[PDB]
Amino acid sequence: ASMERFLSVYDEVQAFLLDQLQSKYEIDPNRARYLRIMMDTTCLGGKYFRGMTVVNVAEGFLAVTQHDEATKERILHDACVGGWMIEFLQAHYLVEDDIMDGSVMRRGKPCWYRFPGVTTQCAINDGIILKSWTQIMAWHYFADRPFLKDLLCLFQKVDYATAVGQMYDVTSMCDSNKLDPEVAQPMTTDFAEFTPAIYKRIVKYKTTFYTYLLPLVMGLLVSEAAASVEMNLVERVAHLIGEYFQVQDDVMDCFTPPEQLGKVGTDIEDAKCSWLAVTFLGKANAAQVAEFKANYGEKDPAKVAVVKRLYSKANLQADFAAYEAEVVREVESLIEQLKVKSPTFAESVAVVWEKTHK
Amino acid sequence: ASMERFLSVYDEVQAFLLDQLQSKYEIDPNRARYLRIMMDTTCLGGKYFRGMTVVNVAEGFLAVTQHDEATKERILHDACVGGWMIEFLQAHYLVEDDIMDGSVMRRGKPCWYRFPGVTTQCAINDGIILKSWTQIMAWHYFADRPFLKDLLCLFQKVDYATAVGQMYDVTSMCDSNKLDPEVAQPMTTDFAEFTPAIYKRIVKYKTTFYTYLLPLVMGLLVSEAAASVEMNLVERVAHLIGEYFQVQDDVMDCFTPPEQLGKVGTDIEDAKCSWLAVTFLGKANAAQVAEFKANYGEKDPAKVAVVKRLYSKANLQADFAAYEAEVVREVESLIEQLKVKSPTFAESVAVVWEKTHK
């Protein structure tokens, strides 16, 4: 099974990284232990959706391509390593984003920086190490691979797009004309930049490149199958599914109970440009817009409750159902176009969509 | 002149990065302005020692090798780009280290995160962007270069060694046996880990890889001259000069006036494993060791003054002169060994040493 193989490779990669720190970086057993615990706490515990997508794409191609058994094993091992590079990249951005946002919990556990023996001083560096490990994995495991250059190039572009996305996200509540390193940034008062186009740009860069595009294209690279697809369709479908994924996360932040969510959602307090805020502003009357402005982006729980009740009374479920019908329609159309060059790849995309939609 | 060429290339690289953000990353003029100012504030203003070393090494080879004029220009441009990759890598670690350490000033100006319109929330990400830019530079400018693979591999190893070094540095005042993410870390009471061997390990990784090794080897790579040297001698001399550089920085932190230093030095308050603390512990009697333990690593200015006077009365100038005589001796010996394969490269190393020593 794919999951058994995926988790066995984590143990192998972890052992390799820590053994390398001992043999080449003069590490002591106590600092190796700290880094082992850091890796487990930051990398494990999720669903491994991003990493398993690489494995699933590679598995799809194996089913229709002629290979020696040793080659099938090599491809599957490469897909697991590539999938772990993505999981570690996600771990890097979660560690850093939790510090930047002052987050309290992550997956029902405290954020890494909040651990007593960690602190922000160490956590920022731990986050840096997590991303350096993705490169150590690539150069070691893919040293002789024909796809090494393309993989490192794609990984770099995705990482950069994601850092650009975090900038778009953290500054989404400021007026663009006021951005100035010399002047403390006031929250917007007009919310003129809370538009579907601006929200789409935030989401496209902050999450879709690393959550959907990177796993799909990495699965193609380790399979030596990039010629079986039209890359423009891959980008379009990845960006489309990724946006839907984030709209789901925005709604859950506001209404999914903290116990089920695994944290206390603070998007309203943080004045985030969420799908709920953009959509609400897209249908509210003058009175509702005014009430929203007087209560958004403030920590006062009475003000947060006003925003939540404004959203509830605005019937955003109808807009969500309408957005979802449009996404089902467009995703199915792009899947159909993917079948022209690769029915196998289209099938992996269908599975990626099914898992997102539910 | 090398400096004129080096600074002209910064303008070109800056223009390329910002133009790429507009054409491919949907950036708006206000966020491009913020990133332009961030780049200038974090990358410029230093002596450009690391970046200019790449240029100087490449210039040395140009003087003794046959090339068309267009090739000499291509090599010099590659050396400037490679030198800027190192300067931007340094900018990344300064931004992040200033946040981690809670630093106030850097080069007589506030630390980047302390700017009113920046904040830690943005600065951590700005630091991440600074390092992604080093990779954007490499993939763009060195796309067709024979040294691209070796350069990216060397850059990754140096970056990882540096992140490992920051971990060694930030945890240098804890007892290794007590390192535990679950438990808040107490300061050491015995200072048994304040030894010359442990101090050497901190310094080797936290600064010598990126300050000395990377500029020298990058100069060789862009010159296609790695066969003109014995790499083991390059590593040994880089590590040796780098250690001397850091011993100088440790002494200046404690005794160079804040006006000349460009900041208020806090190594004593921070309980850092500095050359002054290790050397003092290496010659103190029982009474002096006891007085050091009762005053080190505390913010109280009276306690800091006791440590500074303990250092002053301990005649650490004699130990420094003795360490310096040994370094002059070993650096000169390694330079002599470098002459066997490349008198030109040995000469660039002599210049690197002269600039460090003064």
Ligand SMILES: Oc1ccc2[nH]cc(CN3CCN(c4nc5cc(Cl)ccc5s4)CC3)c2c1
């Ligand atoms: O006033 C409050 C404050 C906090 C609260 N927590 C839970 C509630 C009770 N419901 C409020 C309405 N609701 C919404 N579900 C969606 C789903 C989509 Cl896809 C789009 C818009 C909405 S609106 C579900 C939970 C509540 C009410």
Ligand SMILES: Oc1ccc2[nH]cc(CN3CCN(c4nc5cc(Cl)ccc5s4)CC3)c2c1
């Ligand atoms: O008590 C204090 C407190 C703060 C102070 N600031 C300046 C001073 C006055 N001098 C104190 C001694 N000194 C040192 N120079 C070096 C150089 C090396 Cl290489 C190694 C060890 C030392 S010791 C220079 C400045 C002073 C005194």
Ligand SMILES: [Zn+2]
């Ligand atoms: Zn965030």
Ligand SMILES: [Zn+2]
């Ligand atoms: Zn530091």
